[model samples]
Target: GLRKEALEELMKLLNMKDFPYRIEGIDISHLQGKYTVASLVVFEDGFPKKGDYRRYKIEQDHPDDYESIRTVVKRRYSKHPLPNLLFVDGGIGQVNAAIEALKEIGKDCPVVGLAKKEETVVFENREIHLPHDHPVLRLLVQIRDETHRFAVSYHRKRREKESLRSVLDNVPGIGPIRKKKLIEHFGSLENIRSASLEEIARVIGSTEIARRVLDIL
Candidate 1:
């Protein structure tokens, strides 16, 4: 009931008599449009294949979902094998960006967009609606939700790490050079916190600033 019916629907959409076997879900997450991250989650036979999952840290400073989608898509598909189906996280804009990326790579797959508001699937200029209990739709929903979760978790982690890097900047004696050295030496705030004054001073090149770091942290 689960995969049997689901396979039929998917095959019909792809105009193939056989099942695609692999489907990938893509979603983008960011903070007010910064630190944009994209996640790709793969599902095979309705089950997630965690090893195939990928996360991307977008280099662009701006927060545009479509551009992030394009960037990630290019990064992912440039050398990787294409999945039988690709599902985008948003509505038409994201789907178009994803499609354009595939086109750039000279590849084509059945790409679709899943809108959160209506759980509608947009593909090839048409919309498909299914009842909530439908097995095929349910499988897609699971992939979409998992992709969103993965993207958000990675985005939060990046934001938290970036925020911690700024902690040294606020210290009186720790300028950009010292801050870079501290991070380079200690690797993380926790590591810096555990270091003694002498070790911190050696990396910071300032006993005064090391004392300030100890006090502030």
Candidate 2:
């Protein structure tokens, strides 16, 4: 299959010791105001291992994607073992940020990026364009898209949680007593945001107000 060729080409071109048994992709992104998030996803033998996914709440409080990328690379590898290969969901500078971080930590492994503008594969000193329909292109793009979704989905969820408090106070059916119990039971807006209708309803007496919490959420 074409899929088999993609892995074969990656092994030779990226110079891996074996079929990349484990590969990880890292991407950092956020929304309108603050809270940059970094998401990491792993692929074993070119298939996703969803349970191996992780998210980092970047604490630098700066608005630079490259800086976030640098911080996350260090944080991830400081304790976590390095995978056989690394994919950065960005271009040359992004991959370079990862390389620079690994150097600071006295480590090195294969790292790559796909530059969307040129649809070019990016390495430290080199880049290439595979055939547009090449399975390799499909492979890397899926990795990027998967990481992008993980980071941004959680980013938007956090933002949605941020907007909940104000709306909760104004909901017509909910009153002070119900609000107080919900807060005491769940502890944080985040807890409530993730709560199911059944999860929140247990905190209150009925599903009526719980439905509002979900709708507003």
Candidate 3:
């Protein structure tokens, strides 16, 4: 009875004779596109399967969100098999971007896009609305929001490193390379500041570098 009802529902909505056995959701996160990463969350038989979770760091240094989408999705599913469905958050831009990636990978998996703003459920050219209280809808929203929160938290901590870099960046001789070496050797900025003349010289390339670093601190 459950299978029959599910088949009926699928046929009515998707016009598909086959029912989906596995579904996947995709989400991207970063601090305004720096250190961009994407996550894939999977569901089977309408239940969350935590083991199927996957995260991807966006490989290319590109500003385009669509490119970011394609990069992560391809990285996941190209060498890998496609899922029954691919769910993306956002509007047509995201949906089209994902579809293009799947197309390139020669995948024909059903694609759906859901946007938080309008709660729009997009499939091909159709727009369907599910009840806010529906179990499936609520579950999806919960997953999407959770992924977003996790991504933001990760980004905030990572972004703090930029500020850390800035603190030593203005010193005349402390270029990015030297600064990186100094931090690596000293473990942290505070440690570098408190280090004695001999200790600092041992950490940096030269005693002059250490003397200048101490003066700046």
Candidate 4:
């Protein structure tokens, strides 16, 4: 099912299904001990309806991923209501969390979990093995991978910022304001990687340590 044959099969199944379907893809992003946010991307008629896309910011203790998910799902279903089909991106734990939330709200619908690797189909806390000719399965795999990627990428950015502040705060002569200036000018650590002597000078309005750091780079 990792190849094109599976994709064609999924397309056929989708064509045979009903129209005006609303699929909701759930993605969560957070840093260790930081803000946990859930993103809901909606697809109507097989295309993204960005206007309906939303995010939920959960208040919780840092690094407790399960708590974050629980908070967001509770708030989402309690305030807004559930989507037709919920597509979560993770292992069985994510599904278990979803089921718990739905049970609390006394609702149920078709839910599926798509793991990132191996295109695995997870439903009802079990993996469903399907052949390469199973089209519906392939589409789910794509959606799952995409949502996971988006979530992880957002989390990585949050983590990278925390790491940068951790290190920059320890460096001598680089106070909070100056550190913010450096980050704002450079945008990220990767950009700071290749910063030139002149660019650093422009960032801090000085050539002394800026030139020195540029040389170190």
Best-performing candidate as measured by lDDT: 2
Query: What TM-score would you give candidate 3 relative to the actual structure?
Result: 0.59
The candidate 1 region of ten consecutive residues with least summed lDDT is: 155-164
In the range 1-217, model 2's lDDT, one tens digit per residue, is 1155787777777777777668898887764365678889998877889899998766544568788888888898999999988998888888888999899999988898998677788887567777888677887888888887776677464465445556578667888788777766765577777788997888888898888888876
Evaluation by lDDT, superior candidate among 1 and 4: 1
lDDT for position 214 in model 3 = 77
* Stretches of model 1 off by over 4 angstroms after superposition: 155-217
lDDT of 4 by residue, 1-217 (tens): 1244543454343332433266777887774565777877777666667688777777655755566566767777787766656787766777678877788778775566666464566677887667765666757866665566556655576677666666566666756777788876766667787767787778877788575555444
Best-first order by lDDT: 2, 1, 3, 4
User: Ten consecutive residues with minimal summed lDDT in candidate 2?
Assistant: 155-164
Give lDDT tens digits, candidate 1, residues 52-78.
Answer: 888887765678888888888888888
Each model's C-alpha lDDT?
0.78, 0.79, 0.67, 0.67
Per-prediction TM-score, please? Answer: 0.66, 0.70, 0.59, 0.66
Residue 130 lDDT (model 3) = 79
**Candidate 1, residue 30: how far the Cα is off, in Å:** 1.3
Alpha-carbon RMSD, each predicted model:
5.6, 5.2, 7.5, 4.9
Which of the two candidates, 1 or 2, achieves a greater lDDT against the reference?
A: 2
Q: lDDT for model 1, please.
A: 0.78
